[PDB]
Structures are given as structure tokens and as C-alpha cells.
């Protein structure tokens, strides 16, 4: 996910009129899946 999310970041910089209506639809559900993986990155307990 660290390298996949970087691909559209270097592509939407050439069309600012279209990139506005393309960041307010997928970010709401993507933050939930990323939050579940960010906790286990620093989790040091098996229970």
C-alpha cells in the first residue's frame, strides 16, 4: 500500500480540475482499512 498509493499521487498533479472530485470519494473507506494495519505495525501484545 505504501507503493501503490504513490502512483496516483504523481499522476493527478497534471490535472487539478479533475483531481478535486477524485479525492472526496475513496478516502472515506480507505482510511478504515489503513487504520487496522497501522495498529499492528506498533502492536507489542499478543492479547
Amino acid at each position: 500500500f505504501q507503493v501503490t498509493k504513490l502512483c496516483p499521487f504523481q499522476e493527478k498533479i497534471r490535472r487539478q480540475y479533475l483531481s478535486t472530485n477524485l479525492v472526496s470519494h475513496i478516502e472515506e473507506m480507505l482510511q478504515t482499512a489503513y487504520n487496522k494495519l497501522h495498529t499492528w505495525q506498533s502492536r507489542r501484545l499478543m492479547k
Binding site: 472530485n21 477524485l22 470519494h25 475513496i26 472515506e28 473507506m29 482510511q31 478504515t32 482499512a33
Partner: protein, 50 residues
């Protein structure tokens, strides 16, 4: 025996006008199951999937 019941909420995906907003159930929206041109839908309170 059953656990975890989904309690979604009804939204309109707009503020004042429907055509002024990107409507609901479009292309870039995560709801790619039934695409088209609607006016509103539900979303999971634990995942925010419209």
C-alpha cells in the same frame, strides 16, 4: 448465536442541489456494485463504505 449487526444511516451525498454535487453511486465512488445515477444510499458505520 449472532454478533455484530450492521446499523447504517441514510445520507443524501449533497448539501443543497443534487446536480451541483457529484450525485451518488458514480464511477470513482467505492460503491461499484450497482453503478448508475441515484440520489442517496447507506454506509457502514464501522467502514464508511457507501
Amino acid at each position: 448465536s449472532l454478533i455484530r449487526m450492521g446499523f447504517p444511516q441514510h445520507t443524501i451525498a449533497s448539501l443543497s442541489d443534487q446536480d451541483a454535487k457529484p450525485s451518488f453511486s458514480m464511477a470513482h465512488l467505492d460503491g461499484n456494485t450497482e453503478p448508475g445515477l441515484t440520489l442517496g444510499g447507506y454506509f457502514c458505520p464501522q467502514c464508511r463504505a457507501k
